[PDB]
């Protein structure tokens, strides 16, 4: 379920930049779809939550997706740059996936 991690950076304790590679054998693509493998929107949210809960906001849980936009399709062979910002005072996790232009972006609320 997790993609291949090429590199991670953390320029502040509340920010992360992760370079990810989508392999053809990634199980998200299985049956999604026969005519074209496409990365589901939920998988992009899933990884945001993994890096958020492990690097940025440990002990915080999912509450809502206030807004998400998927504006470009992603397929195997793509390299992604994932940028995440955690604003603890706002309870607000913001993210953007860029093709290594912007593939997706959103705002998630967490609760403790």
């Amino acid at each position: 379920m997790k993609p291949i991690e090429i590199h991670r950076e953390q320029p502040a304790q509340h920010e992360a930049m992760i370079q990810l590679y989508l392999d053809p054998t990634l199980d998200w693509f299985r049956g999604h779809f026969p005519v074209q493998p496409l990365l589901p929107g939920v998988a992009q949210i899933d990884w945001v939550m993994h890096y958020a809960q492990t690097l940025l906001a440990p002990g915080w849980s999912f509450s809502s997706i206030e807004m998400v936009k998927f504006q470009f399709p992603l397929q195997p062979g793509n390299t992604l740059l994932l940028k995440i910002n955690w604003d603890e005072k706002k309870h607000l996790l913001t993210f953007r996936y860029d093709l290594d232009q912007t593939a997706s972006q959103g705002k998630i609320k967490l609760c403790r």
Binding site: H32, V35, Q36, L38, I45, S64
Partner: protein
Amino acid sequence: RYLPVDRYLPHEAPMVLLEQVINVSDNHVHCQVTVSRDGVLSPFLNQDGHLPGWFAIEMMAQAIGVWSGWHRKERKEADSALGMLLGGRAVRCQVPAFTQGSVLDIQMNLLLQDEKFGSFEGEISCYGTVLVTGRLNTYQPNKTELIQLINK
């Protein structure tokens, strides 16, 4: 009676995250799925045996997929081969995860639809208790349309 829920989707196992079509009409769809270790959600459970709350968007998206699939089949139209989620708005969950054993009712109401684009408001409930509300936008492109999108 309805076909198996996978028959209304371009999706195939293991990426079909619903188990039962309960009802479909011109402006509504009701589908069902159970949070179990033996069912379609088992690959997506967290270390504690629960389905994370954010999978609500995918269950809601697929319910919209079932809606469009059913209507294409009633209209003797070609099966869709692709489905895309374009966006979600205020997808708010009362719990961080759906507990093992929960029977989930996914109920979507049509706002706006055309050939390819769809806009739906949604609710996930468990025995009448509302656990998630939200709005979703979807897109059902041709394979050629998708190639043009990818390349142009």
